Design an enzyme around this catalytic site. Sequence first.
Site, short mmCIF file in Angstrom:
data_model
loop_
_atom_site.label_atom_id
_atom_site.label_comp_id
_atom_site.label_asym_id
_atom_site.label_seq_id
_atom_site.Cartn_x
_atom_site.Cartn_y
_atom_site.Cartn_z
N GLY A 34 33.59 31.76 45.13
CA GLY A 34 33.90 31.22 43.82
C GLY A 34 35.12 30.34 43.83
N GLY A 58 38.97 29.92 42.33
CA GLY A 58 40.11 30.61 41.76
C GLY A 58 41.04 29.59 41.14
CG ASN A 59 44.16 30.58 38.42
OD1 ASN A 59 43.53 30.08 37.47
ND2 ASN A 59 44.64 31.82 38.35
CB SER A 74 37.29 26.91 47.16
OG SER A 74 37.84 26.46 48.38
CB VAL A 75 37.58 32.67 47.01
CG1 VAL A 75 37.98 33.89 47.84
CG2 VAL A 75 38.53 32.48 45.84
CG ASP A 123 44.08 33.45 34.98
OD1 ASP A 123 43.63 32.85 35.97
OD2 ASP A 123 43.46 33.53 33.92
C1 LIG Z 1 41.39 33.28 44.09
C2 LIG Z 1 41.58 34.01 45.49
C3 LIG Z 1 42.43 35.26 45.39
C4 LIG Z 1 43.80 35.06 45.26
C5 LIG Z 1 44.67 36.11 45.01
O1 LIG Z 1 45.97 35.85 44.75
C6 LIG Z 1 44.12 37.38 44.93
F1 LIG Z 1 44.98 38.41 44.75
C7 LIG Z 1 42.77 37.63 45.05
C8 LIG Z 1 41.90 36.57 45.31
C9 LIG Z 1 40.46 36.91 45.52
C10 LIG Z 1 39.47 36.28 44.75
C11 LIG Z 1 38.13 36.56 44.88
N1 LIG Z 1 37.16 35.96 44.09
C12 LIG Z 1 37.41 35.00 43.02
C13 LIG Z 1 36.26 34.01 42.89
C14 LIG Z 1 37.52 35.79 41.68
O2 LIG Z 1 38.57 35.26 40.87
C15 LIG Z 1 37.71 37.55 45.83
N2 LIG Z 1 36.40 37.90 45.82
C16 LIG Z 1 36.05 38.95 46.58
N3 LIG Z 1 34.78 39.36 46.50
N4 LIG Z 1 36.90 39.66 47.39
C17 LIG Z 1 38.16 39.29 47.38
C18 LIG Z 1 38.69 38.22 46.61
C19 LIG Z 1 40.06 37.86 46.45
#
Ligand SMILES: CCc1cc(O)c(F)cc1-c1cc(N[C@@H](C)CO)c2nc(N)ncc2c1
EC number: 2.7.10.2
Length: 289
Positions: free
Chosen positions: A14, A16-17, A20-21, A134
Site C-alpha cells: 500500500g 503510507g505517508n 510506498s510499502v 495520523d
Molecule cells: C507506511 C509504512 C510504515 C511506517 C511506519 O512508520 C510504521 F510504523 C509502519 C508502517 C507499515 C505500514 C504497512 N502498511 C500500510 C499500507 C498501512 O498504512 C504495513 N503493512 C503490513 N502488512 N505490515 C507492516 C506494515 C508497516
Amino acid sequence: QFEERHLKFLQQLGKGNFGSVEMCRYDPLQDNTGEVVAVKKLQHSTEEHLRDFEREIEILKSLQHDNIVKYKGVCYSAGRRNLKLIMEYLPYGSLRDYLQKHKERIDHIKLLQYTSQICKGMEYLGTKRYIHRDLATRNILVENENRVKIGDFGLTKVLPQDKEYYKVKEPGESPIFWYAPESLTESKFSVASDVWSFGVVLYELFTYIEKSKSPPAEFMRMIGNDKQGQSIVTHLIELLKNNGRLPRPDGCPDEIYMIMTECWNNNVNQRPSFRDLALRVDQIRDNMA
Ligand SMILES: CCc1cc(O)c(F)cc1-c1cc(N[C@@H](C)CO)c2nc(N)ncc2c1
C-alpha cells in the site's frame, strides 16, 4: 545491516505517508528461506521528505511496545538519499481491511480488545512526548486475531521541551475528518488531539467500516456534499464548534459511544487521557467476559 541486493520484492502493500510499502523477502542465502519484511521507501526522495523520513526512522527505532509495529533496520545500499525502512511484516494487513472483510464476525469483546491495545500503544507513545497525528484504522496493523499494532509514524511530531503542543506551519496532506477542532483552526497537535482521533478510530471500529458510514461520508453529509476544497475545512470547523458529531454506530453499546463523545470534547483539557481510556475499556471488557 540489510543489503539491498538481498531484498527480494514480493508484492505492493500500500501507500503510507509520503511513500510506498512493499512486502519483501530478506534473502542473503538466495534459497527463498529468508524473512518476509515490510519495507518503506520514498517515491520522491527530496531534501524535505528525506529529513521527515529520517525523523520517522529515529522515532520508530526508539519505540519498543507490543502494540507498536517493530522496527528491524534500515537499508542504505542505494545511498544516503535512497533509504529504506525495514519493519516486521504484519500478515493480517491493516485493521481497516481486516474489519471490512470480516464485519460483524468480529464481536464487541474482540473490538474492545483491539481498542484497549490501541490505547496502550498510544499511552506509551505519549510518555515519549510523540504526537502520532495520523491515528486511523488504515494505519493500525493486525498481527493475528489477538493483537493489533500502531503503524504509519510518517506524520509523527515530537513535542518541544517547553510546550504541550506542536504547531505545524505549512501543512501537507491532512486527514481533516480525524482532526480535533484546534488542529483544523490553529494547526495545533497534542496528546489531546490524538485522543480526539482515537474517538474517531473507536467510531470506525463500531461501524465495521460500512462505506456510507465512514467519517468523511458522514461529515460531508452534515456540511453538505456541495462543499468542496478549502470550503470543507471552513464548514467542518463551524459544525464541530456547534457540537455536530459523528452518530452512534448502529448496534454500538451506549458505554462505547459515551467514550467517543468524551474524546470529541471541544475543550482540550476535558478530553480523557489514554491511561484512563485503557483502564475504562479494560473494565468494560471485564463486565462483558
Ligand atoms: C507506511 C509504512 C510504515 C511506517 C511506519 O512508520 C510504521 F510504523 C509502519 C508502517 C507499515 C505500514 C504497512 N502498511 C500500510 C499500507 C498501512 O498504512 C504495513 N503493512 C503490513 N502488512 N505490515 C507492516 C506494515 C508497516
